[PDB]
Amino acid sequence: TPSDKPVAHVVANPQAEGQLQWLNRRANALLANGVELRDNQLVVPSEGLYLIYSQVLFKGQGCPHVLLTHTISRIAVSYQTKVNLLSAIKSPCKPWYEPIYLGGVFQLEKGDRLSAEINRPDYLDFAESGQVYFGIIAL
Amino acid sequence: SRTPSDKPVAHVVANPQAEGQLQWLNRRANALLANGVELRDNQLVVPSEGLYLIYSQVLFKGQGCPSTHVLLTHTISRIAVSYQTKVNLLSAIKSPCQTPEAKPWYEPIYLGGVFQLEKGDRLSAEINRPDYLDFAESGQVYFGIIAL
Amino acid sequence: SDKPVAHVVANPQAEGQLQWLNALLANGVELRDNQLVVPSEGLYLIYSQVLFKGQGCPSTHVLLTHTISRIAVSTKVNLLSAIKSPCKPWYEPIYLGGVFQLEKGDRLSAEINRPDYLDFSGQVYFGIIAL
Ligand SMILES: Cc1nc2ccc(-c3ccc(N4CCNCC4)nc3)cc2n1Cc1ccccc1OC(F)F
């Protein structure tokens, strides 16, 4: 009996310039058991504990002040507010690479919307698959 | 209403009110204890033996670089019921400053590992420089466990 | 639990390679050729961490990669991947994890480019759990 747990694993679009845009219609990417992708956000179908996670990979050629941020955020349907669940900031300054992996476990409610965002889509690297992704897993 | 997991889990966050310290909270938006995990005297208390993922992120920040050399540490340690003394499980150390008389710098430190824990283990997550901790925003500083 | 599950750890005693030792292997999961073998079809959480250490910086530009690949029972495809540029000892972890639909017989690898910079506790591992 295949699992009926809500899950998603969405991957960023390498050819969407100036954007961090999530896709499910790609190999090894997934929306299942009720999770939707709407206006670049993952929409939670039932209340419960979830794992939530995201990775980005940044890359520059040398150093010109560069700040890199990555942030997962929650909009609760009741509260109608957008607040940071998981967030990091790096100041990296020959090519440099900065990956940022965020993960944690959270109580969410039906209708919650989650986003995963960055401040410098121009520094995103897409050289290989699996470098830039966003997901949730119902416990 | 699907069956909740009964696995012990916790994700606690820095108290953004407690400037100059690192105080973990579960009584805070988007922080949690479940299935027997407790937060007592700033430590996480394990309700049953087994493998757990233990993770923490802290974010340090400064305005330029000072005359004394800055060392930033983050340490997760274990106090077992059978040996009630802090033992380091995970640690890291960073030197954010490698400035003539002031650009901000940020140093995020993540610690993660999978460990066999015992019932009643107390887990601490601690830094040496709370004066450099940044809680300008939620989601930056946290400490959690997930029983496998 | 009947769910396939594995958590394997790196041999701190191997020479310039990343060798996984079984740590858990249960309910059909196997370790063959340093790869995990999927006993049945479905959703898996897959996760890994590796740690790197070096004493100071060299004149070769050091790039550290870590990558988890799916080898279809049916060819190797990245599922999860990252890269760090480390350049006084320095220390750098790389940590990965996500949820994937897999098929009976798929193999999974967890590899690095520079085993000579491995740092060897409770922190170098590879694993899966059926959801
Ligand atoms: C880098 C890493 N190391 C890991 C080690 C273990 C697990 C993990 C997380 C959950 C879990 N289960 C099975 C047991 N009950 C809880 C769900 N089992 C294992 C996740 C791990 N991750 C990735 C990760 C970290 C923090 C939160 C979520 C994570 O993974 C997932 F979200 F992709």
Q: Which of residues 25-44 of A touch C (CB under 8 A)?
A: 27-28, 30, 32
* 3-class secondary-structure state, position A129: coil
Neighboring chains of C (3 or more beta-carbon pairs < 8 A): A, B
| A48's tokens | 């419960």
Sorted by sequence, the CB contacts under 8 Å of residue A118 that are 6+ apart come out as A20, A56, A68, A69, A70, A71, A124
Task: Choose among A100, C59, C90: nearest CA to B98.
Answer: C90
Note whether A134 and A22 are within 8 A (CB).
yes
A42: closest CA among A20, A82, A17, A9? A9
CA A90 distance to own-chain centroid: 17
Short-list C50, C108, C102, CA closest to C76: C108
Ligand 1 center to A134 CA (angstroms): 14
Q: Give the one of C82, C100, C101 whose C-beta lies nearest to A55's C-beta.
A: C82
CB-based contacts of A28, cutoff 8 Å, min separation 6 = A9, A11, A129, A130, C70, C77, C79, C100, C101
Q: Which two tokens stand for residue C89?
A: 């000892």
- Round to whole Å and give the CA distance between B49 and B117: 5
**d(C-alpha A66, C-alpha C34), whole Å:** 40
Kindly give the residue spans of alpha helices, DSSP state H, lying in A34-94.
Answer: none
Domain tally, chain C? 1
Q: Under the phi-then-psi rule, with left for phi > 0, alpha for psi from -120 to 50, and beta for the rest, what region is A15?
A: alpha
With H, G, I as helix, E, B as strand and everything else as coil, classify residue A56.
strand
H-helix or E-strand spanning residue A125: none
Residue A18 touches chain C, beta carbons under 8 Å = no
Closest CA to C67 of C55, C58, C77: C77
A96 CA to middle of ligand 1, Å? 28
Whole-angstrom Cα distance, residue C10 to residue C1?
25
| List of residues 6+ apart from A25 with CB closer than 8 A | none
Residue B55 Cβ inside 6 Å of ligand 1? The answer reads yes
Report the alpha-carbon distance of residue C60 to residue B135 in Å, rounded.
38
Q: What is the largest CA-CA distance in chain B?
A: 62
Asked whether the beta carbons of A137 and C131 are under 8 A apart, the reply is yes
Burial class (CB in 10 A: 0-12, 13-18, 19+), A122: exposed
Q: Strands, E, within chain B: which ranges?
A: 9-14, 24-25, 32-34, 38-40, 43-45, 50-63, 72-80, 83-94, 104-117, 122-127, 142-147
Q: Report the distance separating Cα B38 and Cα C109, nearest Å.
A: 37
Q: How far is the CA of C97 from the centre of ligand 1 (A)?
A: 7
- Residue C131 in contact with residue C46, Cβ under 8 Å? no
Query: Between chains, do A130 and C83 touch, taking CB under 8 Å as contact?
Result: no
Contact A49, A106 (CB under 8 A): yes
3-state secondary structure of C83: strand
The closest CB to that of C84, out of A32, A99, A133, belongs to A99
C42: alpha, beta or left? (left if phi > 0; alpha if psi -120 to 50)? left
CB neighbour class for B63 (10 Å; exposed up to 12, middle 13-18, buried from 19): exposed
Q: Which DSSP letter does residue C34 get?
A: T
Distance from CA of C123 to the nearest CA of B (A): 5
The DSSP secondary-structure symbol of A122 reads G
State the DSSP H helix or E strand holding residue A5, giving kind and residue range, or none if neither: none
Tokens encoding B144:
């959690």
Residue whose Cα lies nearest atom 13 of ligand 1: it is: B148
**CB spacing of A87 vs B34 below 8 angstroms:** no
Residue with tokens 């009630």: B84
Our answer on whether the CB atom of B7 is closer than 6 Å to any ligand 1 atom is yes
Residue with tokens 């992704």: A133
Provide CB contacts within 8 A for A56, sequence distance 6+: A12, A20, A70, A99, A100, A118, A124, A131, A132
B110 contacts in chain A (CB < 8 Å): 101
Tokens 């108290």 map to which residue? B15
Out of B93, B95, B114, name the one closest to residue C122 (CB). Answer: B114
Experimental technique: X-ray
Three-state secondary structure call for residue A115:
strand
Q: Do C41 and C53 meet the contact criterion of CB atoms below 8 Å apart?
A: no
Which residues make Cβ contacts (< 8 Å) with residue B103, sequence separation at least 6?
A65, A91, B64
Backbone phi, psi, residue B60, to 5°: -100, 155
CA distance B90 to B144: 13
What are the b/e assignments for A89-121, b being 16+ CB within 10 Å?
Answer: bbbbeeebbbbbbbbbbbebeeebbbbbbbeeb
Chain breaks in chain A (C to N over 2.5 A) after: 64, 93
The residues with which C26 forms a beta bridge, in sequence order, are C5
Residue found by looking up tokens 């639990």 in the block:
C1
SS3 call for C106: coil
Contact flag C97-A53 (C-beta cutoff 8 Å): yes
CA within 13 Å, CB half, A48: 19
- The residue range of the domain holding C91 is 1-131
C-alpha distances (whole Å) from C98 to each of A28, B89, C125 are: 10, 25, 15
Query: How far apart, in whole angstroms, are the C-alpha atoms of residue C123 and residue B92?
Result: 12
Residues of A whose CB is below 8 A from B9: 49, 105, 139
* CA separation, residue A107 to residues B26, B141, C131 (Å): 12, 18, 18
Say which residue the tokens 């954007």 belong to.
A19
CA–CA separation, B5 vs C44, rounded Å? 16
Contact B5 A49 (CB under 8 A): yes
Residue C13 CA to residue B17 CA, distance in Å, equals: 47
Residues B120/B46, Cβ–Cβ less than 8 Å:
yes
Residue closest via CA to ligand 1's atom 21 equals C47
List chains adjacent to chain A, taking adjacency as at least 3 C-beta pairs closer than 8 Å.
B, C
Q: For residue C110, what are its two tokens?
A: 């967890």
Cβ–Cβ below 8 Å for C123 and B90: yes
Among B47, B107, B52, smallest CA distance to B76 is for: B52
State the residue for tokens 């809680």: B135
| Entry field: residues in chain B | 148
Query: What is the rounded distance in angstroms from the CA atom of residue A111 to the CA atom of residue A76?
Result: 7
